[PDB]
Ligand binder design. Structure first.
Ligand SMILES: Cc1cc2nc3c(=O)[nH]c(=O)nc-3n(C[C@H](O)[C@H](O)[C@H](O)COP(=O)(O)OP(=O)(O)OC[C@H]3O[C@@H](n4cnc5c(N)ncnc54)[C@H](O)[C@@H]3O)c2cc1C
Ligand SMILES: Cc1cc2nc3c(=O)[nH]c(=O)nc-3n(C[C@H](O)[C@H](O)[C@H](O)COP(=O)(O)OP(=O)(O)OC[C@H]3O[C@@H](n4cnc5c(N)ncnc54)[C@H](O)[C@@H]3O)c2cc1C
Ligand SMILES: NCCCCN1CCN(CCO)CC1
Ligand SMILES: NCCCCN1CCN(CCO)CC1
Lengths: 588, 588
């Protein structure tokens, strides 16, 4: 396998030095390169068990077996004496810059994955371009560099969640002795949005600076891959041109879906619009039951809004349904109305949005329930959160040969390679993978290392933890209870569970026996923890550390032998004892 | 080892049934016992690899090898037919109640460990008494059942911490759009104390009910162990009597120390008094530098108080000193004054505490700095937080033979046994162990199971995680950096670290590059994580889950291959890359 790896590494790396840590000829080359500001990968063969075998395989490229050996874009460039020859003759810059292509790497999409991949690639001397373009929403909303999470996803969503959480902090403060009267305090949407947008602006600008400082070319243009190595770019002046790249990373992400009903595109909005909305949404209908729908409904209600969620069938399909029900029950008990078993038929406009005074319009929503009753109610804002979809029609001519699945996502090997061998896909468009920002970042950084620094490590997509930032947060890692029972059978599954009450909730007069956690375990495999689930405050902070233990194969006994930190919510995971099979109540 | 275990189990258990899950004679006995409300341990021999060997050893006690076999206090009582004979002749109740001693277990001390041990023992039929008495503080403060954590420790301390955190939540709320004016809001100490005390009262009462419901005798009396099995009790009427017990658990905890300077006992207070203080402390001096001192100083300052901490030498001796400095620096930058390298000489009274109007008195504190300058300043309240000490002189006549160490703590084996073989010690008085509430609870529950249900599992006291609930919280699990370098040498230690900024702090205009985390790893052992350290919000929730992974032997690679949850503080542990040896700045 050593020779397979070395061939792939030499072919792909942009600038790479084979070295040993204790070799002064190697250091001589390193210092010349550093002085010339020539970035490169380095592989220290004295730190690899098969280092000696690697030296022998190198002769198949260089005709020599010694270190250092320098390669550029698949070609042996020289040992120490040859590199210094090139340097002293001012030939080195031209050598390391010579390529069949404009770039070693073109990233199509400047989001979580694409920026992470581009930045990491540049570190190893890959001449990199990042293309990003934000197609405006139907009402004209656009935003800057950084992708969905940064501009219209995880970042503003969690900031507006925090704004919502502060509502309950204001309420709690009275019970803890502060002289506040919560009932006399109101929230100003536009003040919040301005703060959120100023932070997002600092991230847009930070990315542009980061790319400039790492010698990455940022093009604000739409890229279309028209052949394996050619990207056609359309700038914002509609000027069309072609750039070429050795490796291509597709990292274009997804956009919200609209249902095909009259009025939806014209008068509704999506999460793309919400996070910079220049007017307060007012009385709001969220159509959908995804984590986006419930997160958005949740903070709008905590900010004091009149909020309704229209649910076709179930909440959070694909998540543990016991937990999803507890999530929704909390929301319903804390202001959020649910129109259950209900779908929309038509959105009619009653008032146009007030651009001058930053006030919402007014809409009539007509729909129907499964029981035959009609739904007809007025809302100032209607948000569709009914799924997201890739957009690759607009980014690959189908003649390039990149295989998509029936949903339009890219079919990849376990090292992110598409059916076109120099083209890779990462992030939400990679079929079958968890659609999460840290997944995209790890995928892109690890891919860049394999392409340009000879790394072999793959991204592990199993047991990736998640958190839904609903008013009461839901963190999870591993299998839902129903999926575990489906895979292994009910007789091989034991579930330990407990309610709990945050200490913070006692003086504040909040609920007993609402926060809840469970471990779904496999009896025949030493009570291996297959899935962990927690409903409670700070659920992402709670869950994260356990994901390391679950990756390592934690069992129930590993949890039991660990000592809790007191007083915390998380410590209840270390003393669980009630099983579901026992029928004993989990209340405390 | 099987026969050693069985002898110890039979001798110690109060009521125990040797059984098999699939034996209807065993079930016959179980149902009789359950109907008679006779609580017992059960050991199902068909679930132990050495079950068959256990059956053979039982003959050494019972002259039989079959199941079921019932034992009471070291004596074989019968098989199924004999047990039902006793039942039908109404002899069973007297059989299972016969003992040389009044109780199978006497717990001296009704705190975290003692209540946990007593409750768990009762579950297996041990006739149990829990003794608790709260010696009043010098000003007369007393409290109810539950120990230090519940009444004057972890519980009220974290509630008052929450009250302090809400100060910053009120400030943040304005930036997130709420119409509050933080500058016009004040805090009312006594309203907070009343809420805290109402919660503590619910815990005092909850424990009394829990004990009653588990048939545990609660005696509000001071116990003195006068021989191995005799406890002399003095009730609150000063009536003296003697009760006897088979096993004795010492769980009496510690109390605050006072320095031997004029005025300290008369005019200062400790944490014992603070948490129910009927008057607001006002301008406060905390003498000390323990986690108690800094936690108390911290919330008093966040509540708006004028607070000074007098530090003899360093903060948080025994904790990682880089982290301790960062903890103190945050406090100093957020209101807390520090009188460094300073000790007190005298406390003089200037005003007596106002019992009618619930106002503090006034004190003059005289002290001196190491540089020879005098300290002389007035404070309304002076809190000593200069360590805690066991009190066992008042609980064991020294003739019983329980060995204490030079600090007065009980010298125990790894199964909590003292030098008197029926007497055990748990919690803070157990020499050498981490002095934490979940440690005491695990120790007591696991000990009760070994004593009365034949368990073998010991408490693991290694890598016990902690959190200091200072204004910016500090969570830790494992070795400090300096202890790791001392044990293994600097060349075998690699430290990965990073600053971070909570997303919640961006819109709120709080600090960059103040929150901080590090992993202290051992190079020669696959980069094993020896210690984890985090300064940031919710640090106990962050740290807890990682303690499971560290117990399992997590390496840096285990952290790296785990995917972060975004956006959280904790996820930064999954992408650390800057080493201290590299000299690269950890700022982000
Ligand atoms: C409301 C919402 C909340 C979310 N909350 C979380 C959360 O809390 N935690 C979490 O982990 N994940 C969250 N996500 C998911 C997270 O945003 C995505 O998983 C992540 O952004 C995906 O990154 P990506 O690189 O795959 O694509 P994206 O970040 O979407 O970036 C793709 C970029 O490429 C652009 N582009 C598309 N086509 C082209 C083209 N031809 N040429 C040039 N540029 C193009 C796109 O406009 C975009 O800028 C949330 C998503 C949403 C919608
Ligand atoms: C200010 C403060 C804050 C703390 N914060 C935390 C935290 O956040 N997390 C954490 O894990 N730990 C915390 N601790 C430590 C925690 O309180 C102790 O580790 C825990 O309470 C120890 O339990 P214990 O069973 O050993 O003794 P204790 O809980 O102290 O109980 C001993 C009981 O026995 C009584 N007693 C003593 N002698 C006798 C006698 N002869 N007869 C009858 N009764 C007697 C005592 O009055 C007491 O009621 C804190 C401690 C303090 C002082
Ligand atoms: N947009 C699709 C959402 C469903 C994705 N689910 C995958 C498995 N994870 C693991 C936690 O149990 C739960 C969420
Ligand atoms: N009252 C004594 C306080 C010192 C106790 N220390 C022990 C080791 N733990 C592990 C975390 O590194 C830190 C705290």
């Amino acid at each position: 396998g050593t020779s397979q790896w070395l061939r792939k590494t030499v072919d792909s790396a942009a600038v790479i030095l084979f070295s040993k840590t204790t070799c002064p000829y190697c250091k001589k080359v390193k210092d010349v390169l550093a002085e010339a500001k020539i970035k490169h990968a380095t592989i220290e063969l004295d730190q690899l068990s098969n280092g000696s075998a690697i030296q022998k395989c190198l002769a198949s490229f260089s005709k020599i077996e010694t270190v250092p050996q320098m390669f550029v874009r698949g070609k042996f460039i020289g040992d120490s004496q040859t590199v210094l020859k090139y340097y002293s003759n001012d030939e080195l810059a031209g050598i390391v810059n010579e390529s069949k292509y404009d770039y070693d790497l073109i990233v199509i999409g400047g989001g979580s994955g694409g920026l992470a991949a581009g930045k990491e690639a540049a570190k190893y001397g890959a001449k990199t371009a990042v293309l990003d373009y934000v197609e405006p929403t139907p009402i004209g909303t656009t935003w800057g560099l950084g992708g969905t999470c940064v501009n219209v996803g995880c970042i503003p969503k969690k900031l507006m969640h925090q704004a919502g959480l502060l509502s309950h902090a204001l309420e709690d403060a009275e019970h803890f002795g502060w002289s506040l009267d919560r009932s006399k305090i109101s929230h100003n949407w536009s003040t919040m949005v301005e703060g959120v947008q100023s932070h997002i602006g600092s991230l847009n600008w930070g990315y542009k600076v980061a790319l400039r400082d790492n010698q990455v070319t940022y093009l604000n243009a739409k890229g279309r891959l028209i052949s394996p190595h050619e990207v056609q770019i359309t700038d914002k002046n509609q000027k069309v041109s072609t750039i070429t790249g050795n490796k291509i990373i597709l990292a274009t992400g997804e956009r919200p879906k609209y249902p095909e009903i009259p009025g939806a595109v014209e008068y509704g909005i999506t999460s793309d619009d919400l996070f910079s909305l220049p007017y307060f949404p007012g009385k709001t209908l969220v159509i959908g039951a995804s984590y986006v729908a419930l997160e958005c409904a949740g903070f709008l209600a905590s900010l004091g809004g009149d909020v309704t969620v229209m649910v076709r069938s179930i909440l959070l399909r694909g998540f543990d349904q016991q937990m999803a029900e507890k999530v929704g029950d909390y929301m319903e008990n804390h202001g959020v109305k649910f129109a259950k078993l209900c779908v929309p038929d038509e959105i009619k406009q009653l008032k146009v949005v007030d651009t001058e005074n930053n006030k919402p319009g007014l809409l009539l929503v007509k729909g129907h329930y499964t029981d035959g009753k009609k739904f007809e109610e007025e809302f100032e804002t209607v948000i569709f959160a009914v799924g997201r979809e890739p957009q690759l029609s607009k980014v690959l001519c189908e003649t390039v040969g990149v295989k998509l699945d029936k949903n339009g996502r890219v079919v990849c090997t376990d090292d992110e390679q598409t059916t076109v061998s120099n083209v890779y896909a990462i992030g939400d468009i990679n079929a079958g993978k968890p659609q999460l920002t840290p997944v995209a970042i790890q995928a892109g950084r690890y891919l860049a290392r394999r392409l340009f620094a000879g790394a072999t490590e793959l991204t592990d997509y199993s047991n990736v933890a998640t958190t839904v930032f609903t008013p009461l947060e839901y963190g999870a890692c591993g299998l839902s209870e129903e999926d575990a029972i489906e895979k292994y059978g009910d007789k091989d599954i034991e579930v330990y569970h407990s309610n709990f009450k945050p200490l913070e909730w006692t003086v504040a007069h909040r609920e007993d026996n609402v926060c809840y956690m469970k471990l779904v375990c496999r009896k025949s495999d030493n009570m291996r923890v297959l899935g962990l689930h927690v409903l409670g405050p700070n659920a992402g902070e709670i869950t994260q550390g356990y994901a390391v233990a679950i990756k390592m194969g934690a069992t129930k006994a590993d949890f039991d032998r660990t000592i809790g930190i007191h007083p915390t919510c998380s410590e209840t995971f270390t003393t669980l004892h009630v099983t579901k099979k026992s029928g004993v109540s989990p209340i405390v």
